[PDB]
From a paper:
The structure of Cu(ii)-bound SCP_Q111BpyAla was determined to 2.51 Å resolution and revealed a different orientation of the bipyridine moiety compared to that seen in the Cu(ii)-bound SCP_Q111CBpy structure. Despite the lower resolution, the electron density for the BpyAla bipyridine rings, α-helix 5 and the additional C-terminal amino acids (120–128) was very clear, indicative of a more rigid conformation for these parts of the protein. The co-planar BpyAla bipyridine rings are wedged into a shallow pocket formed by the turn between G85 and P89 at the edge of the apolar tunnel. This conformation is stabilised by van der Waals interactions between C1 of BpyAla and both G85 Hα (3.35 Å) and D88 Hα (3.36 Å), C2 of BpyAla and Hδ of P89 (2.87 Å: 3.36 Å to the Cδ) and C3 of BpyAla and Hγ of P89 (2.74 Å: 3.26 Å to the Cγ). In addition, the side-chains of D88 and K115 (one turn down on α-helix 5) lie on either face of the bipyridine and may stabilise the BpyAla conformation by aromatic–π electrostatic interactions. The B-factors for the Bpy moiety and the Cu(ii) ion (43 Å2 and 57.91 Å2, respectively) were lower in this structure compared to the bipyridine rings in the Cu(ii)-bound Q111CBipy structure, indicating that the catalytic environment is more rigid. Among the novel ArMs, SCP_Q111BpyAla displayed the greatest enantioselectivity with an e.r. of 20 : 80 (±1), favouring the S enantiomer, and a yield of 42% (entry 9). Overall, the substrates' activation in FC alkylation mechanism with SCP_Q111BpyAla favours the formation of proS product over proR while with SCP_Q111CBpy favours proR product formation over proS. The crystal structure obtained of SCP-Q111BpyAla_Cu is a rare example of a protein structure containing an unnatural amino acid.
Residue numbers in the entry: 5 to 127
């Protein structure tokens, strides 16, 4: 019953327009625990430490630099721009473990699509 799955799947293709530039600026692994009810429904890893990046189901193959835990609905609230991640973090709806600062980066980076998309041009 998970809507985030669409977002994570679509992310794998976005990294073809954006991957190599994100990896250069982030250089870290991110694990995501999506919860339905109060139970984990899906786990996702966004590896941004090599190449254009990787997104795969399940816990981080290696050790993850940061892990984020939030409900499936709230995850949609965030990716749609309605729920600021820090507001969710301090209200308790979003939980973050590891290097929080690196997730706040992944956030700034991906909100500026123009810089990294053009820098990903070969021409
Ligand atoms: C707004 O700048 C990004 C330009 O590309 C967006 C095209 O997609 C339509 C907008 O809907 C989306 C799609 C994907 C996303 C995610 C969550 C995958 C973030 C992204 C596109 C930066 C990887 C957010 C909104
Ligand atoms: C010290 O800061 C205190 C508040 O901490 C907030 C921690 O942030 C949690 C994660 O922040 C995010 C939120 C969304 C995202 C995106 C939208 C880029 C994730 C995505 C593209 C995988 C949907 C990245 C990082
Ligand atoms: Cu922001």
């Amino acid at each position: 019953k998970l809507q985030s799955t669409f977002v994570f799947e679509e992310i794998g293709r976005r990294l073809k327009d954006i991957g190599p530039e994100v990896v250069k600026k982030v250089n870290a692994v991110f694990e995501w625990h999506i919860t339905k009810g109060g139970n984990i429904g899906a786990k996702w890893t966004i590896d941004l430490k090599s190449g254009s990046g990787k997104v795969y189901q399940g816990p981080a193959k290696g050790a993850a630099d940061t892990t984020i835990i939030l409900s499936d609905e709230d995850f949609m609230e965030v990716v749609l721009g309605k729920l600021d991640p820090q507001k969710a973090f301090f209200s308790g709806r979003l939980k973050a473990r590891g290097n929080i600062m690196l997730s706040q980066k992944l956030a700034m980076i991906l909100k500026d699509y123009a810089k990294l998309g053009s820098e990903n041009l070969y021409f």
